[PDB]
DNA sequence: CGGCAATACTG
DNA sequence: CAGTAT
DNA sequence: GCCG
């Protein structure tokens, strides 16, 4: 009785396989690094299953049965439960190769594609990046210009100030606008690497426009340090910026705004709330086992036999015919 | 063996 | 398009 | 890498 997909089942902020879980995700990441979304993806699947166990893996045939565990992760788990470790994953992290793709990966704007090019022609530290500024994106200039800020974990009360700032620019324009804090604080963590808010007004259409003026009106505050803004296909609903917080006297934390019509504020509250994993597992569920897509918009068939409204994220847990779970429960 | 979430912007 | 962001 |  486990669940395939993991939005089937409750995926808690603490669970009972820590140990376990976390070599499974370092594989999932050495995939990537490789290039293989494919093993990347398998990997993390069998790490969200260990999460979701109500007791830890005494046995190796406490596996039996349980989905996305093939011969690999099978023997992964095998060696570290008689040796408590795991010499492949040992190598891994030990490795000058997965070092630095690591390091080069967590600079905002630096993917697996840069970081490998780069590896490869024999750079190995952030400072020998610096040294070739007329090759880096804006987006990376700026990973590598506020590198010290983006990598200091977001405390929960940056992330009320920061709430405090958008509210009040809000404020400026849109009376009875809210503001909802999602991303992993809603899940329930204490920290983050950015700041994720939705915002959305009661009545259909007044809130049309509203970005623009509160990015206007942070701009004049002079705390815009970078931005990127994006329109669902001025006039743009979604802003991805770094602002500098103040409180060193100022702090570079990132921040993505989002401006959502509350009509289809359900389905914006239930992608941008995560995990990251979650939205794959409930996108490919709604897919594959309900031939319907869905996105931070809506809920879609390809076929107009039906359509699709909702008023929170319970509904929208109906609609697919999946038990609620709560934010806290999503950490897959 | 093919699919693996679904979108938006920069260069 | 290639690559990176959520 | 695991699955249908
Ligand atoms: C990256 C990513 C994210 N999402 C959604 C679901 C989560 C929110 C916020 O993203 P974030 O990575 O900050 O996640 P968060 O959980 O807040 O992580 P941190 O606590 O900030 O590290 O956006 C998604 O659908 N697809 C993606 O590829
Ligand atoms: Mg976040
Ligand atoms: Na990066
Ligand atoms: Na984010």
Known sequence: SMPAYACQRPSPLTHHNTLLSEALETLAEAAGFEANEGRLLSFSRAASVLKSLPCPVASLSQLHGLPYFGEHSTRV????????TCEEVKQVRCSERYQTMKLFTQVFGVGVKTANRWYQEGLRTLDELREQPQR????????????????????????????????????????????????????????????????????????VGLLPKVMSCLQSQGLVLYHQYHRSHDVFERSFCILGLPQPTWKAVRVDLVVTPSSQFPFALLGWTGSQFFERELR?????????????????????????????????????????????????
């Open 77 to 84: 788990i095998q060696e570290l439960l008689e040796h408590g």
């Open 136 to 207: 880096l994106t804006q987006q990376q200039k700026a990973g590598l210009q506020y590198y010290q800020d983006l990598s200091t974990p977001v405390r929960r009360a940056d992330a009320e100030a920061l709430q405090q700032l958008i509210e009040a620019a809000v404020r400026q324009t849109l009376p009875g606008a809210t503001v909802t804090l999602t991303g992993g604080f809603r899940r329930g963590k204490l920290q983050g690497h950015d700041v994720d808010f939705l915002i959305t007004h009661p009545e259909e259409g007044q809130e």
């Open 284 to 332: 490919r569920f709604s897919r594959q086992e309900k031939g319907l897509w869905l996105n931070s918009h809506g809920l879609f068939d390809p076929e107009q036999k039906r359509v699709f409204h909702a008023t929170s994220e319970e509904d929208v847990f109906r609609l697919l015919g999946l038990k609620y779970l709560p934010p806290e429960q999503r950490n897959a």
